[PDB]
Structure formats: structure tokens, C-alpha cells
């Protein structure tokens, strides 16, 4: 899995 | 050939959970370039950061950091759905190139990070040995990850399931559901796998008639 991280 | 140029550590980007995901391996000969395509976690992400690591440790803190950027502008959309690619290339000078753009808007985002960048000839090794020494704990560390962006997941959509059953989901079976994710999201912020799973079979047993939907 390749997910960038949620919004801050 | 003798000798030739590599890039020394293992070069990648912060995903979600707080992990170092590498897109070039150490060591791997210079020039070289790696692409990956990445995605959104979380419905209606419009904005993502690329944050750019040099280092063996799966915890992206425990990393260095060679600088980051922002991409704006992707249509707010489907978790999993945006598909974002990010290159990452080096000269042969050492160079690296940094690219991310996203498939469907065509919005791009860029940046230069100088070869003399990063750890040097020392900090290089520790990072090694470091890694070396904390190889189990950074293991466990990823699975924990995992396990957490999965959880984070059955939260998220059981909640959205829940309110659009409505009424068609007997007042009992919400209850109970609605025990079993507040469990599941106190386990998810610690830091014991089997906890979390142990949370998310809770839930899963409580959820058959919502499931029936």
C-alpha cells in the first residue's frame, strides 16, 4: 500500500 | 569497473502513519531514476505533501529530512482513487530530482535537492548500524502501521454504513456497533497490534445485520 499522509 | 558512484542510503518519501516508504535502495549506482504511483487515504483529499527522506530507519522522524513540497489542486475525490506519480531521479553529479503529478488534473510539483545534501560519511554508518540494531522494533513498527491504516479504514466506513442503513438497522445492533468503534478508536492510538485487531473482530461480530446491508 502506497498512501500519503492525511491532511494536518 | 572498480569503483563507481552510489547513492548511500535508501532515498523515499513519509506515508501515511508516519513511515518511510523508499522509492531508491542504497547503494543502488548513480545515475539512476525510480517512479511510484501513490494515492489519497481519505476522501476529498484536494492537497498532499512530499516529504523527502534519506535513511534506513521505518519510522520517517528517525530519517533526514532533504526538503519538502507541496502538490494543490486534485479533484476531490474517492479514497484510493487520485493517482499521484512520484519520480525520483539522480544525476550523475547527485543531483536528485523530485517530482509528484497527479494523473487526472495534470498538476505538478517539483523540487532540486543538491548533491551534498543529507548525512555524511559518518552519520551514514550509524544510520546503518542504527538500523541494524532496531531492525526488529522497526518491523513491529510497520505491522503496528498497517494495522492502524486499516483499522483507521473499518472506522470510517462502518460509520458511513451506519448512517446510511438509518432505520433499516435496529436500535440494539447500533448500540452495539457504536460500543465496538468507540473501542476500536481508543485501541487504534496505542501502540498494540493485537489490541487493535482483538477491537476491529469486536466490531465485526456486532455488525452482521448492518452487513446484511
Redesign the interface.
Known amino acids: 500500500?502506497?498512501?500519503?499522509?492525511?491532511?494536518? | 569497473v572498480l569503483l563507481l558512484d552510489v547513492t548511500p542510503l535508501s532515498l523515499g518519501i513519509?506515508?501515511?502513519?508516519?513511515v518511510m516508504?523508499t522509492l531508491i535502495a542504497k547503494n543502488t549506482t548513480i545515475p539512476t531514476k525510480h517512479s511510484?504511483?501513490?494515492?489519497?487515504?481519505?476522501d476529498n483529499?484536494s492537497?498532499?505533501?512530499?516529504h523527502v527522506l534519506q535513511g534506513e530507519r521505518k519510522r520517517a522522524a528517525d530519517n533526514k529530512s532533504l526538503g519538502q513540497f507541496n502538490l494543490d489542486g486534485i479533484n476531490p475525490a474517492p479514497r484510493?482513487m487520485p493517482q499521484?506519480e512520484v519520480t525520483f531521479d539522480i544525476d550523475a553529479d547527485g543531483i536528485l530530482h523530485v517530482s509528484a503529478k497527479d494523473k487526472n488534473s495534470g498538476k505538478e510539483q517539483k523540487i532540486t535537492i543538491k548533491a551534498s545534501s543529507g548525512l555524511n560519511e559518518d552519520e551514514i554508518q550509524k544510520m546503518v548500524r542504527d538500523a541494524e540494531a532496531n531492525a526488529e522494533a522497526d518491523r513491529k513498527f510497520e505491522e503496528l502501521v498497517?494495522t492502524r491504516?486499516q483499522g483507521d479504514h473499518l472506522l470510517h466506513s462502518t460509520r458511513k454504513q451506519v448512517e446510511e442503513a438509518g432505520d433499516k438497522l435496529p436500535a440494539d445492533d447500533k448500540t452495539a456497533i457504536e460500543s465496538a468503534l468507540t473501542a476500536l478508536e481508543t485501541a487504534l492510538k496505542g501502540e498494540d497490534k493485537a489490541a487493535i485487531e482483538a477491537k476491529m473482530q469486536e466490531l465485526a461480530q456486532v455488525s452482521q445485520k448492518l452487513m446484511e446491508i
Open positions: 500500500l502506497y498512501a500519503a499522509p492525511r491532511p494536518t | 513519509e506515508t501515511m502513519g508516519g516508504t511510484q504511483v501513490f494515492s489519497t487515504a481519505e483529499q492537497a498532499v505533501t512530499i484510493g499521484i498497517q491504516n
